[PDB]
């Protein structure tokens, strides 16, 4: 029912998900001058060495690669996290044009896309219990800009033709998530929400300072995807991003001076 068009887009979501006007909603603009360097933060430790990708799926608002999370195979720990968070999926948000597409903004600058890597707190047992917890989820957000091609993205790009419309999935084994990470792991962090319905306020956002670059041909193939399912009017999947929400009583902390 909810979507990203004029009639079902982010400005209507509060009618079905009243938490959309809550206190810790996401995304936000990261004012880099008002973020506080916090030395009490630990380095991010990404242990994706034994990650097990399963499928890629068009869910009708994005495409999503899923992982086997029944074991500590790909985990995130450190940073502002307490405990161990298992990788569950990643997905992308992107625009119709290269000057918009990201959900988070940095000094009001929008990037061409955003990669979201979704992890959940193992102490809660499964992901459906974690999403009801104030600290149940950790999302690692990575900006994409348009420049040179990114090799570790090309395997995703090559299969997009197989999942063009909503509900299609394809096998997607032996994918390495480390190929999507920038060279530096400097980050901002703040407590937030999911950026799509149901917009649960369960996320510790970790947003990386350094973007990854992708080529225009690579992003062009993202925009060839469809919101609709097969046998329907053709709606290209673009501008699947929520606009920035007020920070309200929240401080953004930085891991880097
Ligand atoms: N962009 S995000 O903050 O990293 C993010 C991370 C994990 C998520 O699960 C979502 N949200 C969904 O996956 N919503 C599907 C759904 C829609 C309506 N009813 C039930 C389920 C957003
Ligand atoms: Zn997302």
Swiss-Prot record:
Recorded consequence of changing residue 196 to H: Higher affinity for bicarbonate. Enhanced proton transfer capacity
Localisation: Cytoplasm; Cell membrane
Effect of residue 2 to A: Impaired activity, not rescued by 4-methylimidazole (4-MI)
Residue numbers bearing the Phosphoserine modification: 162, 169
Phenotype for residue 195 to S/V: Reduced activity
Subunit composition and interactions: Interacts with SLC4A4. Interaction with SLC4A7 regulates SLC4A7 transporter activity. Interacts with SLC26A6 isoform 4 (via C-terminus cytoplasmic domain).
Protein known as: Carbonic anhydrase 2
């Amino acid at each position: 029912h909810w979507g990203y068009g004029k009639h079902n887009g982010p400005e209507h979501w509060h009618k079905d998900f009243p938490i959309a006007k809550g206190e810790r909603q996401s995304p936000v603009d990261i004012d880099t001058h008002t973020a506080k360097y916090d030395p009490s933060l630990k380095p991010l430790s990404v242990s994706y060495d034994q990650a097990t990708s399963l499928r890629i799926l068009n869910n009708g608002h994005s495409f999503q690669v899923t992982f086997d999370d029944s074991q500590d195979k790909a985990v995130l720990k450190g940073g502002p996290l307490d405990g161990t968070y298992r990788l569950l999926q990643f997905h992308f948000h992107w625009g119709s044009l290269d000057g918009q597409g990201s959900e988070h903004t940095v000094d009001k600058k929008k990037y061409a896309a955003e990669l979201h890597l979704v992890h959940w707190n193992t102490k809660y047992g499964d992901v459906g219990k974690a999403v009801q917890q104030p600290d149940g989820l950790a999302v690692l957000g990575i900006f994409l800009k348009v420049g040179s091609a990114k090799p570790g993205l090309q395997k995703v790009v090559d299969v997009l033709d197989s999942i063009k419309t909503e509900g299609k999935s394809a096998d997607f084994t032996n994918f390495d998530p480390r190929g999507l990470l920038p060279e530096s792991l400097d980050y901002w962090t703040y407590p937030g929400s999911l950026t799509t319905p149901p917009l649960a306020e369960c996320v510790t956002w970790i947003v990386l300072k350094e973007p990854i670059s992708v080529s225009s041909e690579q992003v062009l193939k993202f925009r060839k995807l469809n919101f609709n399912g097969e046998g329907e009017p053709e709606e290209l999947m673009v501008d699947n991003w929520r606009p920035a929400q007020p920070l309200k009583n929240r401080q953004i902390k930085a891991s880097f001076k």
